[PDB]
Amino acid sequence: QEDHVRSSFLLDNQNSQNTVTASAGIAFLNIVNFKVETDYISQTSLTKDY
Amino acid sequence: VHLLSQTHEEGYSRLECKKKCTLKIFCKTVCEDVFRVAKAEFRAYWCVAA
């Protein structure tokens, strides 16, 4: 009797996350008040098995 | 000898992953699937003795 078992397992995984927050607020002496805040998130995952 | 030429259509979803880099610093791999209706014309012939 002869047996040969061969198992191969491969797992790959990548996570990429980017965040940006840009604020700009100008405030005179109780005449003009201007505030602008922008946000940006980017979250990506990728897993590959075999 | 031209036997027959006919066109065949089939819908297939191709999955592809691409690395998009915006501003050369925001690099992310995005995987997208595109459903395309591939169409191909097959022309079958046959060889007779000249």
Ligand SMILES: OC[C@H]1O[C@H](O[C@H]2[C@H](O)[C@@H](O)[C@H](OCCCCCCC3CCCCC3)O[C@@H]2CO)[C@H](O)[C@@H](O)[C@@H]1O
């Ligand atoms: O899904 C929608 C279609 O599903 C079937 O057709 C399937 C077909 O039976 C299968 O073999 C392949 O799907 C799998 C896609 C194979 C090509 C991409 C492979 C990727 C895998 C990851 C690494 C890169 C290559 O095509 C289409 C999918 O539209 C039928 O035609 C019908 O139900 C419909 O039109």
